[PDB]
């Protein structure tokens, strides 16, 4: 099934402006230190996925070269 976080990104209708918007709403004032540490980690994981996808991309494009 894979991780929601990564699968979410494979969704055509996934819109980045939308996702961040729903996320940050949880909510502000004082407890914006709370959500500030949550986003740090969430960012790290997105970062991992970013490089994973880049690696998958690189590997895929190589096969385009006469198989």
């Amino acid at each position: 099934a894979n991780d929601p976080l990564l699968d979410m990104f494979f969704d055509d209708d996934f819109v980045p402006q939308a996702f961040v918007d729903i996320l940050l709403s949880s909510f502000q004032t004082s407890q914006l230190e709370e959500l500030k540490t949550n986003c740090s980690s969430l960012l790290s994981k997105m970062d991992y996925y970013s490089g994973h996808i880049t690696k998958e991309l690189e590997s895929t494009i190589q096969v385009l070269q006469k198989p």
């Binding site: 709403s25 502000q28 970013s50």
Partner: protein, 282 residues
């Protein structure tokens, strides 16, 4: 075509990569913004207490607001988030307005003192530049308020001697006191430069009727003094008659403080306003 599938998979991956990057960038824009709001609320002030010092703190808060505006403009996408807006008016729009209050009241006070006007030109220049950067319209609505205050005080001091025109030379001096303060304020305003070209004075004078600060100054005090003078003269009362009986003294005290007309001077024209106010002598 087991050569189309890899071409399709690749295309898809490009999309996923771009979506992750956008999500990442936006999220970090937000993150940096928040860290700044945190850093904002960590700088308290000292309001309407110019202990010097308290101004150095105010400049740092102002600079923070500059950064805020930069971060939002760097990613315009940042603005349309209902949790960035919710702090935009709950934390920054108030902090902003408290700072504005601090700057405009400190600048107005430092300008109406006439002393600080000459004694601390470097202090006032800092206030002008600062306030313009934060919210230019507030600098004007502050200069508006200051100018309007000087016209009011001087116009008042001239009319007070109508019932004692013997002292008119003294009042006519106090008017020049402010006139000079305005001469040095507009200098001063021009000394503060803006984007590419121009200055703050030209920009104020453009969004106003006015041509110079002096010109609107005299014009306005000349009216509310003209009105008083003539009202008093037309009323056939004793002061109205002392107005006429002391007529040369007035015209005399005027030239002895302005220079009198066309050729020489420079105080001509600015002289011409004070002459028109006092013109029923005919």
């Amino acid at each position: 075509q087991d050569i189309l599938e890899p071409f399709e998979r690749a295309l898809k991956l490009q999309t996923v990569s771009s979506k992750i990057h956008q999500t990442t960038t936006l999220l970090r824009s937000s993150l940096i913004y928040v860290h700044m709001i945190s850093q904002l609320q960590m700088m308290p002030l000292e309001t309407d207490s110019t202990d010097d010092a308290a101004l150095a703190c105010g400049l740092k808060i102002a600079a923070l607001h500059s950064q805020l505006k930069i971060n939002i403009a760097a990613n315009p996408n940042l603005a349309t988030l209902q949790l960035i807006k919710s702090c935009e008016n709950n934390v920054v729009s108030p902090n902003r307005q408290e700072l504005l209050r601090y700057l405009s009241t400190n600048l107005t006070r430092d300008c109406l003192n006439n002393l600080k006007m000459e004694n601390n030109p470097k202090r006032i220049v800092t206030l002008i530049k600062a306030l313009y950067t934060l919210s230019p319209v507030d600098l004007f609505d502050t200069i508006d308020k200051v100018l309007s205050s000087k016209i009011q005080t001087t116009a008042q001091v001239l009319s007070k001697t109508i019932t004692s025109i013997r002292n008119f030379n003294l009042s006519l001096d106090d008017a020049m006191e402010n006139r000079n303060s305005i001469l040095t304020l507009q200098n001063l305003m021009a000394a503060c430069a803006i984007e590419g070209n121009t200055n703050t004075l030209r920009n104020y004078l453009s969004q106003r009727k006015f041509s110079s600060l002096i010109d609107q100054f005299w014009s306005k005090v000349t009216n509310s003094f003209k009105r008083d003078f003539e009202m008093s003269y037309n009323r056939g009362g004793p002061v109205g008659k002392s107005l006429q009986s002391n007529s040369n003294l007035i015209y005399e005290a005027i030239s002895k403080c302005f220079g009198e007309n066309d050729p020489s001077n420079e105080l001509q024209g600015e002289l011409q306003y004070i002459l028109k106010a006092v013109s029923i002598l005919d």
